[PDB]
Design a protein around this motif. Sequence first.
Motif, PDB file in Angstrom:
ATOM      1  N   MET A  88     -45.296  32.770 -32.660  1.00 14.66           N
ATOM      2  CA  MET A  88     -44.455  33.920 -32.225  1.00 14.66           C
ATOM      3  C   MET A  88     -44.301  33.998 -30.699  1.00 14.66           C
ATOM      4  SD  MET A  88     -44.422  37.727 -33.884  1.00 14.66           S
ATOM      5  CE  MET A  88     -43.723  37.078 -35.402  1.00 14.66           C
TER       6      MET A  88
ATOM      7  N   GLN B 113     -54.253  30.378 -31.931  1.00 10.15           N
ATOM      8  CA  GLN B 113     -54.104  31.247 -33.097  1.00 10.15           C
ATOM      9  C   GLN B 113     -54.861  32.565 -32.937  1.00 10.15           C
ATOM     10  OE1 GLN B 113     -55.231  28.174 -35.761  1.00 10.15           O
ATOM     11  NE2 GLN B 113     -53.149  27.335 -35.824  1.00 10.15           N
ATOM     12  N   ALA B 114     -55.999  32.516 -32.245  1.00 15.71           N
ATOM     13  CA  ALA B 114     -56.779  33.713 -31.935  1.00 15.71           C
ATOM     14  C   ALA B 114     -56.007  34.651 -31.005  1.00 15.71           C
ATOM     15  CB  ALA B 114     -58.128  33.338 -31.334  1.00 15.71           C
TER      16      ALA B 114
ATOM     17  N   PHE C 140     -59.520  36.821 -22.820  1.00 15.37           N
ATOM     18  CA  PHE C 140     -60.614  37.309 -23.657  1.00 15.37           C
ATOM     19  C   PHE C 140     -61.519  38.343 -22.994  1.00 15.37           C
ATOM     20  CE2 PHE C 140     -60.229  33.481 -26.682  1.00 15.37           C
ATOM     21  CZ  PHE C 140     -59.455  34.230 -27.568  1.00 15.37           C
TER      22      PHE C 140
ATOM     23  N   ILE D 236     -57.858  27.112 -18.609  1.00 17.34           N
ATOM     24  CA  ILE D 236     -59.186  27.482 -19.124  1.00 17.34           C
ATOM     25  C   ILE D 236     -59.547  28.880 -18.623  1.00 17.34           C
ATOM     26  CG2 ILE D 236     -61.696  26.989 -18.953  1.00 17.34           C
ATOM     27  CD1 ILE D 236     -60.305  25.118 -20.971  1.00 17.34           C
TER      28      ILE D 236
ATOM     29  N   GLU E  38     -52.740  34.834 -30.523  1.00 21.56           N
ATOM     30  CA  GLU E  38     -51.553  35.364 -31.181  1.00 21.56           C
ATOM     31  C   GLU E  38     -51.860  36.412 -32.245  1.00 21.56           C
ATOM     32  OE1 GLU E  38     -48.951  31.606 -31.756  1.00 21.56           O
ATOM     33  OE2 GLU E  38     -47.822  33.190 -30.738  1.00 21.56           O
ATOM     34  N   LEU E  39     -52.978  36.242 -32.951  1.00 15.93           N
ATOM     35  CA  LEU E  39     -53.442  37.241 -33.910  1.00 15.93           C
ATOM     36  C   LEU E  39     -53.851  38.525 -33.186  1.00 15.93           C
ATOM     37  CD1 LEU E  39     -56.411  38.283 -35.568  1.00 15.93           C
ATOM     38  CD2 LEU E  39     -54.167  38.355 -36.702  1.00 15.93           C
ATOM     39  N   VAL E  40     -54.562  38.377 -32.066  1.00  9.90           N
ATOM     40  CA  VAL E  40     -54.986  39.513 -31.244  1.00  9.90           C
ATOM     41  C   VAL E  40     -53.777  40.297 -30.734  1.00  9.90           C
ATOM     42  CG1 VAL E  40     -56.045  40.173 -29.033  1.00  9.90           C
ATOM     43  CG2 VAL E  40     -57.292  38.713 -30.610  1.00  9.90           C
TER      44      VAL E  40
ATOM     45  N   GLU F 282     -57.507  25.720 -28.184  1.00  4.55           N
ATOM     46  CA  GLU F 282     -58.162  26.199 -29.404  1.00  4.55           C
ATOM     47  C   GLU F 282     -57.999  27.716 -29.577  1.00  4.55           C
ATOM     48  OE1 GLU F 282     -59.755  22.415 -28.147  1.00  4.55           O
ATOM     49  OE2 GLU F 282     -59.909  23.132 -30.218  1.00  4.55           O
ATOM     50  N   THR F 283     -57.749  28.417 -28.469  1.00  4.27           N
ATOM     51  CA  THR F 283     -57.588  29.878 -28.470  1.00  4.27           C
ATOM     52  C   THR F 283     -56.199  30.335 -28.942  1.00  4.27           C
ATOM     53  OG1 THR F 283     -56.824  30.285 -26.177  1.00  4.27           O
ATOM     54  CG2 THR F 283     -59.203  29.969 -26.488  1.00  4.27           C
TER      55      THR F 283
ATOM     56  N   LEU G  49     -60.306  32.472 -20.617  1.00  7.69           N
ATOM     57  CA  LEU G  49     -61.458  33.313 -20.280  1.00  7.69           C
ATOM     58  C   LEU G  49     -61.029  34.723 -19.871  1.00  7.69           C
ATOM     59  CD1 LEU G  49     -63.173  30.754 -17.801  1.00  7.69           C
ATOM     60  CD2 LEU G  49     -63.931  30.987 -20.174  1.00  7.69           C
TER      61      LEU G  49
END
Lengths: 95, 104, 91, 98
Positions: free
Chosen positions: C1, C63-64, C35, C28, C66-68, C60-61, C32
């Motif tokens: 999205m 999907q996390a 989050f 990176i 975008e969900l957040v 790696e962050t 950080l």
Amino acid sequence: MLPNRMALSRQTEDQLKKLITPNIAARLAFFRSVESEFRYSPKKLDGTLVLDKITWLGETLQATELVLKMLYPQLEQKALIKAWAAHVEDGIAAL
Amino acid sequence: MLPNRMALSRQTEDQLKKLKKYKITPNIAARLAFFRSVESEFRYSPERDSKKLDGTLVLDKITWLGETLQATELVLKMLYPQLEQKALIKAWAAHVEDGIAALR
Amino acid sequence: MLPNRMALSRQTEDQLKKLKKYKITPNIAARLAFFRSVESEFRYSPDGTLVLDKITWLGETLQATELVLKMLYPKALIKAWAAHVEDGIAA
Amino acid sequence: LPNRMALSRQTEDQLKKLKITPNIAARLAFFRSVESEFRYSPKKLDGTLVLDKITWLGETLQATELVLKMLYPQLEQKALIKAWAAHVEDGIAALRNH
């Protein structure tokens, strides 16, 4: 549920040395490791830095315990500390 | 961070008992309603959504949420980082009310 | 999205670049900072040189992240991500 | 992560036995299953109802793919559909049997 107070391994804190406050580093390294392919495998957590669960995890507390529940529905609380510390260790190694 | 014993409002627990088929029990209906509301665009407003939780059915946190417990408490935390336990049940109750409306 | 290519503001990027140690790359640092902000109580209320792939920024962050953002703000999402990176890099 | 997906003919039969709408029911069943102890283990998805990923998951899309990535970080999309379908199937089974 994780225990009220916890510590990492002496190697994990040595890896941190090689790599900010340690507790924040423990949060960011945890999530870095979880998002990878690394998983906990059955260890003495003899680090000098023992801290409160609240101090270690902060607001990531809920998320940490949730992910540990998801990734390892088999483990009861005793080995959850072990899994958490293994992810922090793997995470710092990744960074 | 949600309290140990909790209730919905009289209206919401009634609506909850009405969802009978997809067979369906009140606490399960509540879980389905919470998730359904969370996956919607509806978000709790402490000023205009808060009600008194005067329901007859008071149960354990574990009894209400079951396996959805950790995930419920994380979502309620992420969406509402301001609210403590007191208004957290109210945030949960608002999603249950919204969701059960959506499910029928 | 989120769009495939995205950039921050000149200031946020500058702050990211200042965060170099504890051997750190800006993207990176952005992971950080997003989050650190999201874990805080900060929420978004409505010209950087580095335009990068969604995968380059988040890794790696992805999907996390975008969900957040989906949960917090159910686009103008880039402005929300940039604002969270903005909030987090300061702290 | 495929754009179009279907359940198995068997899982769709189970949905019929459960009795409200298929896609929401699939989301509820999935998350019910994934919060349990059930984990996918390597089934052929011969369902009549083929739908968009968007249609199936809706707003649960990002959460679904996040959980699938977390629980099965090794798999590429091909077996990810199978993992999702197994969780939906198990979920309906759990909802049917309380």
